[PDB]
Amino acid sequence: HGSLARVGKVRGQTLKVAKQEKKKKRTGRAKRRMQYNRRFVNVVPTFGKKKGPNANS
Amino acid sequence: KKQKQEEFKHIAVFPCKMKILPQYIFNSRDPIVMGVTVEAGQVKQGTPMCVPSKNFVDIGIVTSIEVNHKQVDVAKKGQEVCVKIEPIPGESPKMFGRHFEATDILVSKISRQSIDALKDWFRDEMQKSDWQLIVELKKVFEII
């Protein structure tokens, strides 16, 4: 606890999780090429409702 | 500093423990002129004065302090002084032998704002014994 007026407590007592070494994302023209391929090339005919691009069910 | 003393001198009540001499009584009411020894603390002119033994009855404010016919403003511990007490206007004036007697120990009626002024601005002029008298009267006056 400490006090009700402790400033910045939740920023200061949360756990520190380090970053992850990830691959360089290509930016510019080929990113639009990847977006076009993933949207309008690899589409499969489904039924009902299409899940979102971040649908982590 | 002298100017700030001049405005805030009316609020600052100095601590005191001061003891009535038997039969050294020269007046009874309006004014009360009476020869009293100072057991502890120091007396300053304009002090509100009270009796703890009779449910914190107030006798009035002092006007003039005389040490063997000499007008001395400060009456310190160990000195037998003559104190002239004027009753507070608007209240009932007090008599000797009915509201208070010779066996009573009369103390200064300090206030919380006076304690604040003594702690904040009058830190230089008060002794450790005077601060102990302040704490003792604060437990007597039931001030938290």
Binding site: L4, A5 | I143, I144
Partner: protein, 99 residues
């Protein structure tokens, strides 16, 4: 049930006068009158009466406003007065729930 104590910035106080608009003033045990606040967990669940012992939080940048944490009942206030976390001259005045 438990006896929570003070901390390095948390002290004790006694309510003097009940105040409107979800606030109160309480007499701290240092000689300073502090305007306290009712905690949002205490706005309807439990009530605070006049002259009761409560736990109060403080601000480290000002001393004009404060905030109440919890409230002590009669037996635990007497037990904490017996331990010595409270001054002996502090009048608890037997705060209790009547019938």
């Amino acid at each position: 049930r438990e006896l929570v104590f003070k901390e390095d910035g948390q002290e004790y106080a006694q309510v003097i006068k009940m105040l409107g608009n979800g606030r109160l003033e309480a007499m701290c045990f240092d000689g300073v009158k502090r305007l306290c606040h009712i905690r949002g967990k205490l706005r309807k669940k439990v009530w605070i009466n006049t002259s009761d012992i409560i736990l109060v939080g403080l601000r480290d940048y000002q001393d004009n406003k404060a905030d109440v944490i919890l409230k002590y009942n009669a037996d635990e206030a007497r037990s904490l007065k017996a331990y010595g976390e409270l001054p002996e001259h502090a009048k608890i005045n037997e705060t209790d729930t009547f019938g």
